[model samples]
Target: LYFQGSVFGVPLTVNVQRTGQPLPQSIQQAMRYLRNHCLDQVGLFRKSGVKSRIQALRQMNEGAIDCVNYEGQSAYDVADMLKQYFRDLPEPLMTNKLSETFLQIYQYVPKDQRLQAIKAAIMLLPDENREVLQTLLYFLSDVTAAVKENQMTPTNLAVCLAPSLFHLNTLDQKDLNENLAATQGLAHMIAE
Candidate 1:
């Protein structure tokens, strides 16, 4: 599966080294499109994409996104595919083992110390997870930086994205949907 098939089922560990970007190539394609085309999109990542368009895009190979045959792919389509790729993964970006630790750190660590704790936890992630997540956060911060045009503050991005980043299978949806803590934590996370 060296970038030949659909990218959705490939584990980040098994497939990430093959492409060598901080994030998967397909994801980068989406992020690249988002930043380039939709920084001022009124709702941005929070908005849903055309499901039909998203379905076709996800079926593409990892290398396919770069081909860029727009045909009609909107930034919203790319955004939906980007987040879908993360959510479809067997393990979330933080990984199952460290995912809870992240939630705990964000939920319980004192606000003044939260960034330090988040940074420490990020360091503890497996190498690929660390690199990919760090890159993703940097991208999100860029989105946050476009606040006036995009109307997507860090909190807005967090609310939309935090669920995709952390996965606790035992209570996956339960924990990910904790509106208050996770969003606040993720809001603080993209601060830098």
Candidate 2:
């Protein structure tokens, strides 16, 4: 069957060969549910279908067809229903690594004010490091496709931004401090 842009063929004559004694009632009930609802052409077209298909593919690749067991109704179905049932389930946003701590300090700054902070930081950097910073920012904006597809979570973004702040501090450069302030101000806008 075609699922998630791929085809699958589930063989018949599949039988249960238990490794353990009689399973728990919940397990038995779930196993029955899987047998009934998850067989070929049954619930295979629903959201659960996509999830099952993905799981089955993973199992097939690992040479363990029997390992693909449906625990319950589809996770895809549950996720969809959750969004429909709860109006407040916000869309997933990428976590900005830099904003985690800096945001608390600079969230109140106006957008223009934040940009000024970034500019100040740029001016403080030695020419080479300043170029590296520019390249990093460019990668975030333009060359994102080649990198790991993380949403730049606040913690991760902090990993990038924090180093430069520390470098500026150790240099005892007053302009570096200004840059730190600027970068902090810009963190909120970047995360947004």
Candidate 3:
């Protein structure tokens, strides 16, 4: 199937094939799978075992027929894993040229203009990547009930999601702190 949309005024098209992989059925499952697989070890995301993991994730992202463990995982797992895949890249899914602008608009734009700016920035992503993001955002928006059940506040979800959703070359403590603070509002909006 072909998925089509417009982001930041750019048109995008993605061709999706039905691979026999079973993905996570719910957002909670997706989140749990990522939490369990990607962060099983503390402080290890940028350290050991990342290269191999990234390779596997890349294969899955490209829809390699044999890349995933479908019998053991779900579609949501695929989605969450894709998010992690982007996070692990040397460069984030959002290009360097637009990363700072994307952050500024997301953080400083007035409420009325924020979504428009954010959508435009997201459109700067490659077509397949944009589709992954849209899917994840939609899942996040639908996972409010599960969030409470999992004992995660919207702020917590925002903090967990920030690194995967956005990035820049000079991402520092202050940038992260600011993004975490900003993410609270963004998460609330998604949850609502």
Candidate 4:
């Protein structure tokens, strides 16, 4: 399956190749907003609570680049997330620019090819732009790492990592009750 289909079964043949059409305007807008809000120094500080998250982006990118050295699939997933939000974007959104350094993490190349691509991109970036990319990359890596490790309680992580992480906390009792049903189902599954 190209995308997830069912929770109980494994999928096969996921293809993440470029679609000829540009990304939809809504998604593009959301990404641009995130990039703007999350990449600014003030924004980064507010979101991550640590300046090190910025440095972590660069280090994680390098580590990801290293992991992809041997035909790793998750590496491609990481690059794709960056590419979807960074490069291969359309005009206007692309033209407006998030940070000059944003495109440095292009997702077009596979993990095997990302190291050289990253090096070349870095060489072309200004110091300030490089710093922004580093921070953004770090945030991306941190997010991915957190998800992989299942580091947070499911409900808490869901609140923080969901597409609507902010609004999750505001969900009404009905929504919370519905969420509880799903959690109960999982608990029952575990007991089986």
Quote each prediction's TM-score. 0.83, 0.27, 0.50, 0.23
Q: Candidate 1 or 2, higher lDDT?
A: 1
Residue 88, candidate 3: Cα error in Å is 2.3
Model 1 C-alpha lDDT per residue in residues 1-192, reported as the tens digit of each score = 234444776777766566665456656667777777678887778999999988777666355443434335777888777887788777887666555565677668886898888778778778877877877888888888889988898888887886777643323454553434556767888878
Please list the C-alpha lDDT of all candidates, in the order they appear. Answer: 0.71, 0.34, 0.46, 0.31
Q: Whole-model lDDT, candidate 4?
A: 0.31
Question: Relative to the unseen true structure, what is the C-alpha lDDT of residue 30 in candidate 1, on a scale of 0 to 100?
Answer: 70
Per-model C-alpha RMSD: 3.4, 19.9, 8.8, 20.7
TM-score of 4: 0.23
Highest-lDDT candidate: 1
Worst 10 residues of 4 by lDDT: 7-16
Q: Give the alpha carbon lDDT tens digit for every residue of 1-192 in model 2.
A: 222211112111111122232112222333344334433322121233355544443333233222333455563332222222112112111112233334433545565676565455346544433443443354333212222432344333433444333322223444454445435543433343
Cα displacement (angstroms), candidate 3, residue 95, comes to 3.1
lDDT score, candidate 2? 0.34
**Over 4 Å off, model 3:** 1-67, 70-83, 97-99, 106-108, 168-189
- Model 3, span 43-85: residue lDDT tens: 2222233445544444443442223343354333444455554
User: lDDT score, residue 139, model 1?
Assistant: 88
Name the lDDT of candidate 3: 0.46
Whole-model lDDT, candidate 1? 0.71
Which ranges in model 1 have alpha carbons more than 4 Å from their true place?
1-5, 62-72, 106-108, 168-180
